[PDB]
């Protein structure tokens, strides 16, 4: 009975940690897509100014 | 002969233990460095202190104790202090970071890292005993290491030793004065998982002691040093029976048989009398009858509760010093006669009495008067049911909005455990209600 | 054992952080040259919470200094104790932020942050038990909020289980220091609320009032205001360094202080504070410390706590004290002023006591409150943001770096949700 | 560390620059020959003057500046004068013939002959910087060379550097006082082609200065020397932040972030206080609160306009010398309270504050009192919209009869350019009307 209670607690904890890692990876991917989008928008504005001159 | 192992867990555990070991050394004449100026016999015999100290070397007395914490600060205070030479280095065990009052941090995430070390030390010490009777565990209920680790330790000891008694000395959450805002969660969880593994838990309360110190010793500023010395005196009277000859000796085993009428009701409250400063002791006659009656007043309980609202199920009196059995018996008969003290109908013989010849010891620099005789009382009453009810109420108010719940869930404690522990406590409240109904 | 990495950023952050290190060196007996010249063993037992030990028995602050303009750092190095920070931890760019959050977060900071992180990794590798990070910064500026949240996010991804604490200077209620504060502050809060464990809110408007009203300084300077901030920062971690009757570290404070994961903005305070001339007329007792701590006029946040309720309060005391007095005075406060605390949390006060007072005092205490009154700060920022956003005033400066309206809109919505969540519990 | 390049164009540009370089030398202790009596460190360090002077030879300090004119006379006065040994020969650039107040000669016919020389020199100087922040260009609006050449230069720099800030200090045509009969043509043409290339242009006015000199300094004959010294003090306060430590530092980039709410509105007006002669200063109390209030007085504007006719969009207060942050904060709150000072509804946070420790310097032989503290204010207001309207009116009256038009057409300008420039100015007036409307 003791080992079984302890093993269930271990399994819950590990699943929790896997979900946390997934959320952290999603946050990272959202920031990288956002930053890259910002760089592209900035690049395009600058090229248009050069075309204008 | 007979041996007893002391385990001190967490901040409160270690600080009380320091008060206890100073007192044991004074009573036996053992110096802080483990030497004895009158060490005439080395390695055994009686020398009754062999109950608590191991005999080694060529006159070194080593206390049978283990001090455990998840954080190093309190233990380091021991390691560099006065008694640094008294304890073996492996009796002082530390982790790196505390549980932060998170039950789950202590029980599920951190404690697993040192529990095997702690158990191995207990094993090595236990193997040197021939007459081990039990363990004494010192802890607090609302604490992180305190309850997290104690619960973990209790389960493991139940498996490995099984039959040795396990007595717990602990600090119950006070009704008004608190030190954390999460205590209701920690206390409910502790009882749920530890209740079935303990044989008898003795309760004390800091709030009640604060008032005793103020009224009886006239201490307007009763800090932890003073509280720890009063707790130490109670513990000493309980174990004095093993160490000193008495008229009626009581071992550790007889306490759980006399004070626990049902397996789920094992929480006697402790008291002690006289508590008096020297200035007043000089003018009073601290007779057997007077001390005995003092122990039953609502004004001298070490637990803030009110005994007049419950009934006594069992009552254990321990006398020390200049005590005569006929005076003791007469005092008890008076108490049985007095109508304000009620006993349950199913317990016609509620009293059990031990008497020891050795009078109490005053620690130099202490508050207490030197007296010829003192009485320690342990009582199991239904009055305590109210304290449990207050605690359950506080739990419900916070759980209802899930305040702070994510702090336990994030450590691996499945949310449903909170509900199961609550249901169990409801059952405990009901068990008290039933034994309290006369029929 | 437990170690703290200290990161300072932007002009404000470096001014406060430099004062912080001066205060710690005095507490531990550390000379401006790094040599130890103290008088108690307790100064060395936990010296490594904040310092690395260099050969020759010298101590080096485990601190990192970050900026986009080198002028700030030259001031740090030339002043008192400027010589104790190692040169390898001065990490900086050349361009400055221009008070443009977008530049601080997406361009200039975007390039500098890799160097900062490499320094952070070298420092965390030297720890036996890293416990957490402390970041010092402002919210209404460029480098401060740009690098502030850029670093917080990167660190949270790499060290998801360490403690992340910040001390932030917030926009004042009457006088702005920067014309576009509402944009910088809204964008910053949006990210802080997701990544940190606790934030202390510091308002110069409140600090000017305290040093003028209580300490009677008619000519306070930033050095004096920085002193008050430093005293609080030091008080928070006292128990990691010194022994006492009942301890609490950073992890314990977070557990007791935050009932719900998003409500972690605190209003700090400090006691005793007296003017020099009046020092001679008031005895300091525990009841006196309690009286000054629970005082609307002694809060360092510019938000009146009497307009809301306390979810929780921490009181950390330093010096020899009666435990009974500490417990009793806290009980008396909750019982007599019950209208200011939430009824769903039995016991709203957590305490700790360390045995060593700040140098020069017999005793002192630090107050940390978690009050729903804080919604006023967030509400003010939201309304100012709205007024400017609606006419896109000064907005082309952010969109010119590649930010857009969608980013601004999301930050606005989160600001408003945080306010609703605080209101929900009053 | 951080560097700044100064460009001085035409008659007004060069003469103001001379006033500035004398003041910079006095503040740093640099002699007219580039030597320093206390030249203890050579080639770098701080020596904060390294922002404006490069370190060459073995102790010579060389200003980072370029002086450009089409007319050889003003530069020759520099070349044979006191500071002839301070500037590098290639920093003094001249043509052979002036623009003769013809915009087109300055822009299309003559300016093209030296623009490549000027740009190459700017490039060589820029390449020696490691932290160039921007350029400061000094010019006049109604000037032939001033605006013809500046417009040409601005276009070329915005292509080659792009991201460096470009700040302009310029003299706005006065409403009554004028020197040329064609200023309305030159000013409209300048704004049309330069508006899009400048980040922020600070306005001053000779007519307004003459009144200040007469009222505050009691000067009945305020010749250009005096005007140039007052202008120099404003420029110095703006750049002092880079050169001296402050309580709150402000770089050059921060000015455009705080003062320009929309890309087409970037003409803050400058003021300065206190302006006082020594004789009155002896009796005055030049407190922080008084100096601050003085900056909002209609009688102390450096631009002849009336601030009570518009609203403020953004105000930047630069304090120098003995200034306490608390007093600055209190003084601002007072200004916001006064109902006579209006701000646009869309700008709830209209102020920016910088504080520097270094007090202002008085040039020996000057008019100004030595003071402990001074304030420079830069502010963007809608009041200026009226000045633009007056200028457009004058243009229309002359264009209607084609007065002097053939002088521009004969240089290669098309008639269409006059019409287009006028249409754009109509748009600029409308832009101010919209920001001025609360909703
Ligand atoms: N009687 C008495 N009680 C104490 C003493 N020190 C602490 N306590 C009690 O201990 C309780 C809290 O539990 P702790 O023992 O501090 O818990 P811990 O072992 O440090 O583990 P953490 O909670 O994670 O820090 C409080 O309610 C205090 O009243 C003491 O010296 N004497
Ligand atoms: N404040 C100030 N203004 C000056 C000074 N010298 C000339 N000006 C102004 O300059 C304006 C005319 O433009 P300038 O720069 O002088 O002439 P330019 O650059 O040689 O070009 P041309 O028009 O072709 O002669 C006039 O309206 C004067 O008010 C001076 O020393 N100080
Ligand atoms: N308390 C305090 N605040 C400061 C100090 N220096 C600057 N500040 C504040 O910093 C804010 C401006 O942003 P800042 O951090 O200086 O610009 P940044 O370098 O781009 O981040 C204002 O709200 C100032 O009041 C200081 O020494 N002490
Ligand atoms: Mg602990
Ligand atoms: Mg000319």
Author numbering:
A (entry chain A): 87 to 139
B (entry chain D), D (entry chain B): 1 to 439
C (entry chain C): 1 to 44, 47 to 360, 369 to 436
What did the study's authors say about this model?
pmcKinesin and dynein are microtubule-associated molecular motors that are differentially regulated to deliver intracellular cargos to their destinations. Intracellular cargos are sorted by structural MAPs that decorate the MT surface. Unlike tau, MAP7 is a required cofactor for kinesin-driven transport in cells. The MAP7 projection domain binds to kinesin’s coiled-coil stalk in vitro, recruits kinesin to MTs, and activates its motility.
The α-helical density for MAP7 is not uniform. Segment I (residues 113-139), which is the best-resolved region, makes extensive interactions with tubulin: Q113 and E117 of MAP7 are within hydrogen-bonding distance of N197 and S155 of β-tubulin, respectively; R114 and K127 of MAP7 engage in electrostatic interactions with E159 and D414 of β-tubulin, respectively. Y108 of β-tubulin inserts into a hydrophobic pocket formed by R120, R121, and V124 of MAP7. We also identified potential hydrogen bonds between R128, R131, and K136 of MAP7 and the mainchain oxygens of E411 and G410 of β-tubulin and V159 of α-tubulin, respectively. Segment III (residues 87-99) interacts with α-tubulin. Segment II (residues 100-113) faces a cavity at the intra-tubulin dimer and has the weakest density in our map. Alternatively, the flexible segment II may accommodate kinesin binding by shifting away from the intra-dimer interface, as proposed for DCX and MAP4 (14, 21). To distinguish between these possibilities, we determined the structure of MTs incubated with rigor kinesin (K350E236A) and MAP7. The classification resulted in two distinct maps of the binding site, one occupied by MAP7 only, and the other occupied by kinesin only. Thus, kinesin and MAP7 cannot simultaneously bind to the same tubulin dimer.
